[PDB]
Amino acid sequence: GLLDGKRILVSGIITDSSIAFHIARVAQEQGAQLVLTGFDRLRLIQRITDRLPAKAPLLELDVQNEEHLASLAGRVTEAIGAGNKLDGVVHSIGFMPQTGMGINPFFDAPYADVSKGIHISAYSYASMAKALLPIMNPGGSIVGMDFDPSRAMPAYNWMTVAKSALESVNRFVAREAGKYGVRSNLVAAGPIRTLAMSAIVGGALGWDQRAPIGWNMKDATPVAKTVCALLSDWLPATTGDIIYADGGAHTQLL
Amino acid sequence: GLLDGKRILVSGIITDSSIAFHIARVAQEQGAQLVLTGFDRLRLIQRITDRLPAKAPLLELDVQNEEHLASLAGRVTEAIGAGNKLDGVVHSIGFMPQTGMGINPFFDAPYADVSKGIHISAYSYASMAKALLPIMNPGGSIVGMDFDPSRAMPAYNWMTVAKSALESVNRFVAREAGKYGVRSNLVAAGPIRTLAMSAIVGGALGEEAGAQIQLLEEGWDQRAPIGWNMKDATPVAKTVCALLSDWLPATTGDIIYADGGAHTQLL
Amino acid sequence: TGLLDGKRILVSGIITDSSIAFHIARVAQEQGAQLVLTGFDRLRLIQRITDRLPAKAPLLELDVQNEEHLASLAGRVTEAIGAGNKLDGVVHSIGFMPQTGMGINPFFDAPYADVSKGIHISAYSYASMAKALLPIMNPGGSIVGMDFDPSRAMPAYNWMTVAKSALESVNRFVAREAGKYGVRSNLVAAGPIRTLAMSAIVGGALGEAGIQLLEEGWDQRAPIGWNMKDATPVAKTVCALLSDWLPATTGDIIYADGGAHTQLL
Amino acid sequence: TGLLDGKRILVSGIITDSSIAFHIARVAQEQGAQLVLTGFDRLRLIQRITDRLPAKAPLLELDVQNEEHLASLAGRVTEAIGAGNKLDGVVHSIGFMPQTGMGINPFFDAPYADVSKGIHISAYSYASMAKALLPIMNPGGSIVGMDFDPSRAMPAYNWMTVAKSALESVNRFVAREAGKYGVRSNLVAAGPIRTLAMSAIVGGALGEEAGAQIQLLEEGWDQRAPIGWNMKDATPVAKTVCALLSDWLPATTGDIIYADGGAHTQLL
Ligand SMILES: NC(=O)c1ccc[n+]([C@@H]2O[C@H](COP(=O)([O-])OP(=O)(O)OC[C@H]3O[C@@H](n4cnc5c(N)ncnc54)[C@H](O)[C@@H]3O)[C@@H](O)[C@H]2O)c1
Ligand SMILES: NC(=O)c1ccc[n+]([C@@H]2O[C@H](COP(=O)([O-])OP(=O)(O)OC[C@H]3O[C@@H](n4cnc5c(N)ncnc54)[C@H](O)[C@@H]3O)[C@@H](O)[C@H]2O)c1
Ligand SMILES: NC(=O)c1ccc[n+]([C@@H]2O[C@H](COP(=O)([O-])OP(=O)(O)OC[C@H]3O[C@@H](n4cnc5c(N)ncnc54)[C@H](O)[C@@H]3O)[C@@H](O)[C@H]2O)c1
Ligand SMILES: NC(=O)c1ccc[n+]([C@@H]2O[C@H](COP(=O)([O-])OP(=O)(O)OC[C@H]3O[C@@H](n4cnc5c(N)ncnc54)[C@H](O)[C@@H]3O)[C@@H](O)[C@H]2O)c1
Ligand SMILES: CCCCCCc1ccc(Oc2ccccc2Br)c(O)c1
Ligand SMILES: CCCCCCc1ccc(Oc2ccccc2Br)c(O)c1
Ligand SMILES: CCCCCCc1ccc(Oc2ccccc2Br)c(O)c1
Ligand SMILES: CCCCCCc1ccc(Oc2ccccc2Br)c(O)c1
């Protein structure tokens, strides 16, 4: 398997549509041993993770909770056994209050709302790296999820700003991670039908055409595969960077 | 008179080294009628602005103060006369706490500090646009100051993240401003000796900050095909004035680099 | 009082009064510049066109594929602007790609001889012109070329996109050379404008063409809108770069496209 | 151990055992790929070099400026892999620029005939090879070319930088064509590697300003790379190419993957 013998933490499962769920499934199919983290509704999340190919410890992690972050490494070590470390970490976490999204006027989002979104969607990438690098092996890999924010667009509004911040954060996390022999990268995914897409983006409210190899919004697997590629030993010279799993859409104007 | 008859708001003057001070000076040399905004040290800033070529009204603006923002357009209108609107707005404002800068570990900056910096340095570009677009004329121009954050680097740390956010904010402000026939752009400047350079950046570099800033300039000037002088804000001020003028009428949501060309060269 | 008062500027690329170069020339003269013009092939026609400008400027022949023309260029310019005078600006507004390299013609079917001709005229010649003219430019001077953002592929532009990608790279190296003379080098990436090249080269290779959709999409993306029939905003931007008001910008690209490239949709 | 198990892959660009293409071929074979190799001009030497690979692989002649070679390529490949079989992968690891276009030679003094030859071999031929080989590629297939980030100018690289800028653009159009076949096209932008191609850049540069500039660029690369950069180690670049050849980056095309230690993401 691509990830045989690798110990990987995966955050961000909320439903079986979650990009993180597919990342977890594919990683398990590829031999990885997982530690999962979930936010808020852990009982409900556990029922979802029970549907994964293999058993995995589920740990609670609210990235705005300083104690959760402080205790994370210790709780992970308890789950994987003393003397063992992680080889991979997946940040698949985002949030933005409704005022910062959709048809709500860009100028009307209060800073308190924007700040919450940036905390959860961007700063927390640094928080998780801070918490977990001390228990990561050399050759390890941290991967976060991105949506190309290089151009403005309808609806994505302040989440675009949060992703621009996340890209910059990733470049600095790479400088820290390199001290541990660890890579840090983002995967910029095209649109996928997830809860966030439905409840956050859709609640607040061309890709296949542009993508030379097409794009299926109902299929998170190609994105999951791309994350697994970064978690593997097969992109060993790439860090601080962004890999686009978007069908090539961002490389085409029409 | 590049800006003859234009009414332009300029924020960000704190000393006569401020990039905003030179923007104001050059704009007045080019015929602009200014309204200035200052933060915190209003008595001192008034003395500074007395050193500008022409008299200009000074208004208080703390961009974290909701009341200041809510009253801003009315206060500007009082300053320029009823029925008159602005043709230009200059955002030349930033802040980051020391924990977010320099040799202080990147991971050790608390979010409260990072958030304050992002509020002042990035969100406030949207706040200022929100406040002032209702009193801007078609053909108008909003300009903010940037430092190219497309790559990470020593010391700039969380301010790099704030500038990355600011660039994104600018692209959305352009969408809103277009409804008013107004452009929104950033000028990404090379390093200039200002109070922020000395007190924020320099303060966080530890001992021999002076030598490190000298080395930064040396590298920048080497990389820049036309060279770079960190003691001279005039080239940056002229660039901002170009964007405030009628001579870049088809540019919006964009970034103009006033950096000697350094960002175009690897070595 | 003009933006370009007292400046001596060479402008290449006029073929009709719709040429981007024609509008650049017009605005530059309105702003006090003294021009020397260069033209390719149809010189008598070009002379008739330039009789429509505010002031009649000398026209020099320049086929950028002709080594003899390039070798004699600086001397001919100096005679036209008067010995003792140097240039303050140079405008490269030149491009070409054979039909095989454009439109609905298959990308893979363009022979290298055709692609190479297009790259010679559209990209290499920016270096050729800088080589010829830098020795007669004043410090503070400005070389400007015309670009069309090639960072993403698109229908129809095909191999011209490749030539523009090459041109952007050439510009960054010309900036290194030009800096030795205190001269800036930059490109203006313009949105779509109804010119002879748009009609004859682009439109011609589109076959059964009538571009309307291109205009509508561009104007929709551009937060301040975009008018394909109006070259003036592009001409103004070029004049900004020729002026003293962007003195710290070189090796760069300024986008005069209504902001379209900053918006996804 | 089997990243490319069962995949048939063409690898161009081996001239020495220091060639990036040699290491690509080596790593691909380690991962189960069945290769066909192509070489230019010195075919006897290249055959002896390719005998040093972990497994045997047929060698074909290909001068990318030779229209006849390109026209016969698909048929010669099919002869090598057997009728009814197709390629799953293609590696373009080919570059050339005449001496006038590189190094201490002034940028303005390179004649267009020289620049054009370099662009022909280094950029246009990516399209040439895709045109020839797409009709014999399977869906899910992958074409990969080698890039050196040309987004900023730099000392010595001169007209090759222009050729790479052209190659990046070509790749985006090749992706449009390749997509019709269900095939991806991407470039790997590698950091500097001490292949025997280095003399093309540093040749004659000692004592000249360019000499120190080239070394400064190389040392700066390792400095900027958050995980460091070893110019003597082609393996990480080879692995990256293999990742693109694999089934594990199925949604990436018209794109550039940077195998450079992360250096391009850091200003200092
Ligand atoms: N769905 C898409 O189209 C798409 C495209 C590109 C990038 N992304 C990114 O992928 C990642 C996952 O999003 P998704 O589309 O799978 O939607 P999702 O709703 O399935 O996952 C989002 C996750 O964020 C978690 N989260 C929110 N606040 C948290 C907190 N305070 N602490 C810890 N976790 C918290 C949620 O609990 C949830 O599991 C995000 O970074 C998102 O921006 C999604
Ligand atoms: N100095 C450089 O090298 C350089 C380079 C590129 C970009 N910039 C940018 O230029 C701009 C001006 O910086 P400067 O270098 O002229 O330094 P400066 O210290 O002269 O100006 C910074 C300004 O921010 C103002 N400010 C801070 N908090 C504020 C608040 N809550 N409300 C309103 N104003 C507030 C300060 O009072 C001051 O006037 C900033 O955006 C900075 O990041 C500076
Ligand atoms: N029209 C647009 O939409 C548009 C948009 C962006 C950039 N551009 C660029 O603007 C510039 C001018 O193009 P235009 O649109 O005004 O079309 P145009 O047809 O009016 O001008 C093109 C010019 O190229 C000149 N030229 C061709 N071969 C030459 C040679 N061998 N030597 C010297 N000159 C030669 C022609 O004579 C002509 O004057 C080009 O670089 C073009 O790619 C055009
Ligand atoms: N070595 C580096 O640091 C580096 C870094 C990034 C990218 N690259 C790229 O990697 C690729 C291989 O470079 P390398 O360093 O392994 O050098 P190399 O000399 O080992 O390989 C270059 C290959 O091009 C082949 N070639 C030249 N003309 C040809 C023609 N007419 N037809 C077919 N093949 C031809 C040569 O025979 C040779 O095998 C090139 O595209 C190069 O630009 C090299
Ligand atoms: C122009 C249309 C924009 C749709 C983009 C697709 C998309 C959907 C959900 C995302 O996940 C989130 C989006 C917003 C807040 C939180 C999360 Br998780 C995300 O990052 C990106
Ligand atoms: C050695 C690190 C590189 C920085 C050099 C240039 C510079 C200096 C001051 C700035 O102004 C600020 C910098 C940080 C916070 C607030 C302000 Br205003 C700024 O944006 C950029
Ligand atoms: C749907 C197709 C896209 C058209 C874009 C607009 C445009 C038109 C003409 C141009 O000028 C030329 C275009 C090609 C060859 C020569 C010249 Br000059 C140019 O650069 C760009
Ligand atoms: C100042 C820059 C120093 C580092 C450059 C690394 C490098 C070396 C050889 C290359 O391959 C070639 C470069 C030129 C001609 C032929 C070939 Br193969 C190439 O693309 C890139």
Q: What single string gives the DSSP state of each residue in B104-156? A: S-GGGS-HHHHHHHHIIIIIHHHHHHHHHGGGEEEEEEEEEEE---SSB-TTT
Separation between Cα atoms, residue A217 and residue A215, nearest integer Å: 6
Helix axes A221-231, A19-29, angle to 10 degrees: 60
Ligand approaching nearest to the C-alpha of C12: 3
Asked if C130 and C178 touch (Cβ cutoff 8 Å), the reply is yes
Separation between Cα atoms, residue D96 and residue D94, nearest integer Å: 7
CA B181 to chain CA centroid, Å, is: 22
CA distances from C181 to C134, C241, D103, D170 (A): 7, 17, 21, 34
Residue with tokens 């979010």: B111
Q: Is B27 in a helix, a strand, or coil?
A: helix
Cβ count within 10 A of residue B12: 24
Q: For the domain covering C1-265, report its CATH number.
A: 3.40.50.720
Residues of C in contact with D165 (CB under 8 A): 165-166, 168-169
Q: Is A131 in a helix, a strand, or coil?
A: helix
Q: Is C217 in a helix, a strand, or coil?
A: helix
Asked if B34 and B2 touch (Cβ cutoff 8 Å), the reply is no
D156 lines ligand 8 (CB under 6 A): yes
The partner residue sitting opposite A153, judged by closest CB among C153, C155, C264, is C264
What contacts A169, CB < 8 A, 6 or more positions away? A122, A123, A125, A126, B161
Separation between Cα atoms, residue A219 and residue A5, nearest integer Å: 27
Task: Report the DSSP beta bridge partners of residue A17.
Answer: none
- The single-letter code of the amino acid at A31 is G
Residue with tokens 């201490």: D104
Separation between Cα atoms, residue A9 and residue A223, nearest integer Å: 17
Residues of A in contact with D175 (CB under 8 A): 212-213, 248, 251-252
Task: Annotate chain D with DSSP letters as a single string.
Answer: --TTTT-EEEEE--SSTTSHHHHHHHHHHHTT-EEEEEE-S-HHHHHHHHTTSSS---EEE--TT-HHHHHHHHHHHHHHH-TT--EEEEEE------GGGSTTS-GGG--HHHHHHHHIIIIIHHHHHHHHHGGGEEEEEEEEEEE---SSB-TTTHHHHHHHHHHHHHHHHHHHHHHTTT-EEEEEEE-----TTTHHHHTT-TTSHHHHHHHHHHHHHHHH-TT---TT--HHHHHHHHHHHSSS-TT--SEEEEESTTGGGB--
Asked if A151 and A209 touch (Cβ cutoff 8 Å), the reply is no
In sign, the C-alpha dihedral spanning B13, B14, B15, B19 is negative
CA A98 to chain CA centroid, Å, is: 20
Q: Please calculate the CA angle C123-C129-C131 and round it to the nearest 5 degrees.
A: 110
Asked if C47 and C59 touch (Cβ cutoff 8 Å), the reply is yes
Experimental method: X-ray
Residues of C in contact with B183 (CB under 8 A): 224, 259
Tell me the pairing of strands D34-39 and B86-91: unpaired
Query: Which ligand 4 atom is nearest residue D200's CA?
Result: 19
Query: Of the CATH numbers 3.30.930.10, 3.40.50.720, 3.40.640.10, 3.40.50.300, which one belongs to the domain with range B1-267?
Result: 3.40.50.720
CA distances from D7 to B248, C27, C61, C208, D247 (A): 54, 61, 57, 43, 10
Residue with tokens 């002032």: B132
Asked if D27 and D101 touch (Cβ cutoff 8 Å), the reply is no
Pocket of ligand 1 (CB under 6 A): A 12-15, 17-20, 39, 61-64, 92-95, 120, 145-147, 189, 191-192, 194-197
Which residues in chain A belong to E strands, given as ranges? 7-11, 33-38, 58-60, 86-91, 136-146, 183-189, 241-245
Q: First-to-last CA distance in chain D? A: 37
Q: Ligand 5 centroid to A155 CA: how many Å?
A: 9
In sign, the C-alpha dihedral spanning D243, D245, D250, D255 is positive
Residue with tokens 């001889």: C113
Separation between Cα atoms, residue D172 and residue D169, nearest integer Å: 5
Separation between Cα atoms, residue A161 and residue B169, nearest integer Å: 6
Q: Which tokens is A68 given?
A: 């959760």
Asked if A124 and A72 touch (Cβ cutoff 8 Å), the reply is no
CA A90 to chain CA centroid, Å, is: 5
Q: Do B242 and C245 touch (CB under 8 A)?
A: yes
Separation between Cα atoms, residue D240 and residue D188, nearest integer Å: 7
The partner residue sitting opposite C172, judged by closest CB among B252, B254, B264, is B264
Which of A151, A163, D180, D36 minimizes the C-alpha distance to C222?
A: A151
Q: Supply φ then ψ for residue A223, to 5 degrees.
A: -70, -45
Mutate to test the pocket of ligand 6, among B11, B21, B156 (most ligand atoms within 8 A of CB): B156
Asked if D201 and D103 touch (Cβ cutoff 8 Å), the reply is yes
Annotated ligand binding at D63? The verdict is yes
Asked if B197 and B220 touch (Cβ cutoff 8 Å), the reply is no
Annotated ligand binding at B62? The verdict is yes
Sheet bearing A86-91, strands edge to edge: A58-60, A33-38, A7-11, A86-91, A136-146, A183-189, A241-245
> Which value, to the nearest 10 degrees, does the dihedral of the CA atoms of residues A182, A188, A189, A194 take?
80
| DSSP 8-state class, residue B86 | E
Separation between Cα atoms, residue C150 and residue C161, nearest integer Å: 5
Residues of chain B in Cβ contact (below 8 Å) with chain C? 1-2, 171, 174-175, 177-178, 181-183, 189-190, 224-228, 235-236, 238-239, 241-242, 245-254, 256-261, 263-265
C203 lines ligand 7 (CB under 6 A): no
Which residues in chain B belong to E strands, given as ranges? 7-11, 33-38, 58-60, 86-91, 136-146, 183-189, 254-258
The partner residue sitting opposite A252, judged by closest CB among C152, C217, C263, is C152
Residues of C in contact with B253 (CB under 8 A): 223, 259, 262-263
Q: Which tokens is A135 given?
A: 């228990």
Separation between Cα atoms, residue B162 and residue B125, nearest integer Å: 11
- The single-letter code of the amino acid at B247 is W
Residues of C in contact with D153 (CB under 8 A): 169, 172-173, 175-176, 251
Separation between Cα atoms, residue B41 and residue B32, nearest integer Å: 25
- The single-letter code of the amino acid at B129 is A
D160 lines ligand 8 (CB under 6 A): yes
Residues of A in contact with C154 (CB under 8 A): 252-254
What contacts C99, CB < 8 A, 6 or more positions away? C105, C201, C204, C205
Which of D169, D190, D191 minimizes the C-alpha distance to D255?
A: D169
| DSSP 8-state class, residue A156 | T
| DSSP 8-state class, residue B95 | -
| DSSP 8-state class, residue B174 | H
Separation between Cα atoms, residue C65 and residue B109, nearest integer Å: 59
Between A and D, how many residue pairs show a Cβ–Cβ distance under 8 A? 139
C160 lines ligand 7 (CB under 6 A): yes
Q: First-to-last CA distance in chain A? A: 38
Separation between Cα atoms, residue A99 and residue C45, nearest integer Å: 60
Residue with tokens 């990256």: D240
Which of B34, B42, B66 minimizes the C-alpha distance to B241?
A: B34
Q: Is C156 in a helix, a strand, or coil?
A: strand
C61 lines ligand 3 (CB under 6 A): no
Task: Report the DSSP beta bridge partners of residue A22.
Answer: none
Separation between Cα atoms, residue D227 and residue A238, nearest integer Å: 9
Q: Ligand 4 centroid to D20 CA: how many Å?
A: 8
Task: Annotate D153-199 with DSSP letters as a single string.
Answer: B-TTTHHHHHHHHHHHHHHHHHHHHHHTTT-EEEEEEE-----TTTH
Residues of A in contact with D225 (CB under 8 A): 178, 239
Residues D200-228 as b/e (b if ≥16 CB within 10 A, e otherwise) read bbbeebeeeebbebbeebbebbbebbbbe
Helix axes C125-133, C67-81, angle to 10 degrees: 40
Residue with tokens 């490389």: A251
Pocket of ligand 4 (CB under 6 A): D 13-16, 19-21, 40, 62-65, 93-96, 121, 146-148, 190, 192-193, 195, 197
The partner residue sitting opposite A161, judged by closest CB among B115, B165, B175, is B165
Q: Which tokens is C189 given?
A: 């990436």
Separation between Cα atoms, residue A19 and residue C49, nearest integer Å: 61
Total number of residues shown for chain A = 254
CA distances from B181 to A38, B8, B158 (A): 46, 16, 33
Separation between Cα atoms, residue A210 and residue A247, nearest integer Å: 8
Q: Do D252 and A241 touch (CB under 8 A)?
A: no
Mutate to test the interface with A, among D265, D266, D267, D268 (most CBs of A within 10 A): D265
Mutate to test the interface with D, among A238, A246, A252, A254 (most CBs of D within 10 A): A238
Q: B262: distance to nearest CA of chain D, Å?
A: 9
Separation between Cα atoms, residue A27 and residue A61, nearest integer Å: 20
CA C179 to chain CA centroid, Å, is: 20
Residue with tokens 């990404």: B188
Residue with tokens 């040749």: D203
Asked if B151 and D265 touch (Cβ cutoff 8 Å), the reply is yes
B12 lines ligand 2 (CB under 6 A): yes
Between A and C, how many residue pairs show a Cβ–Cβ distance under 8 A? 24
Separation between Cα atoms, residue A188 and residue A206, nearest integer Å: 17
Asked if D68 and D61 touch (Cβ cutoff 8 Å), the reply is no
Residues of A in contact with B111 (CB under 8 A): 119, 123
Q: Is A107 in a helix, a strand, or coil?
A: helix
Asked if D74 and D136 touch (Cβ cutoff 8 Å), the reply is yes
Mutate to test the interface with A, among B64, B111, B120 (most CBs of A within 10 A): B111
Asked if B190 and C248 touch (Cβ cutoff 8 Å), the reply is yes
Q: Supply φ then ψ for residue B82, to 5 degrees.
A: -55, 140
Q: D144: distance to nearest CA of chain B, Å?
A: 25
Q: For the domain covering D1-268, report its CATH number.
A: 3.40.50.720
Separation between Cα atoms, residue B163 and residue B95, nearest integer Å: 11
CA distances from C29 to B245, B248, C4, D187 (A): 19, 18, 8, 46
Q: What is the 3-state secondary structure (H, E, C) of C34-60?
A: EEEEEECCCHHHHHHHHCCCCCCCCEE
Separation between Cα atoms, residue B94 and residue B63, nearest integer Å: 10
Q: Supply φ then ψ for residue A160, to 5 degrees.
A: -60, -45
Burial class (CB in 10 A: 0-12, 13-18, 19+), A189: buried
Asked if C158 and C110 touch (Cβ cutoff 8 Å), the reply is yes
Q: For the domain covering A1-254, report its CATH number.
A: 3.40.50.720
What contacts A185, CB < 8 A, 6 or more positions away? A141, A142, A143, A144, A170, A174, A230, A235, A238, A239, A240, A241, A242, A243
Task: Report the DSSP beta bridge partners of residue D89.
Answer: D9, D142
Residue with tokens 């070329």: C145
Resolution of the experimental structure, in angstroms: 1.6
Mutate to test the pocket of ligand 3, among C10, C94, C143, C230 (most ligand atoms within 8 A of CB): C94
Q: Supply φ then ψ for residue B215, to 5 degrees.
A: -65, -35
Residue B266 has, within 13 A of its CA and on its CB side, a CA count of 26
Burial class (CB in 10 A: 0-12, 13-18, 19+), B18: buried
Q: Ligand 8 centroid to A231 CA: how many Å?
A: 30
> Which value, to the nearest 10 degrees, does the dihedral of the CA atoms of residues B106, B109, B110, B114 take?
-90
Q: Ligand 6 centroid to B97 CA: how many Å?
A: 12
Asked if A203 and A197 touch (Cβ cutoff 8 Å), the reply is no
Q: Do D173 and C152 touch (CB under 8 A)?
A: no
Asked if A27 and A228 touch (Cβ cutoff 8 Å), the reply is yes
Ligand approaching nearest to the C-alpha of D40: 4
Query: Which ligand 3 atom is nearest residue C41's CA?
Result: 37
Asked if B61 and B87 touch (Cβ cutoff 8 Å), the reply is no
| DSSP 8-state class, residue C120 | I
Residues B78-117 as b/e (b if ≥16 CB within 10 A, e otherwise) read ebbeeeebbbbbbbbbbbbbebbbbebebeebebebbbbb
Q: Ligand 5 centroid to A133 CA: how many Å?
A: 27
Between B and D, how many residue pairs show a Cβ–Cβ distance under 8 A? 28
Q: What is the CA radius of gyration of chain D?
A: 18
Separation between Cα atoms, residue B203 and residue C91, nearest integer Å: 45
Asked if C90 and C8 touch (Cβ cutoff 8 Å), the reply is no
Which of B250, B256, B260 minimizes the C-alpha distance to B178?
A: B250
Which of B150, B146, B153 minimizes the C-alpha distance to B216?
A: B153
Cβ count within 10 A of residue A155: 15
Q: Is C14 in a helix, a strand, or coil?
A: coil
Residues of C in contact with A252 (CB under 8 A): 152-154
Separation between Cα atoms, residue C159 and residue C99, nearest integer Å: 10
Helix (H) or strand (E) holding A49: helix A42-49
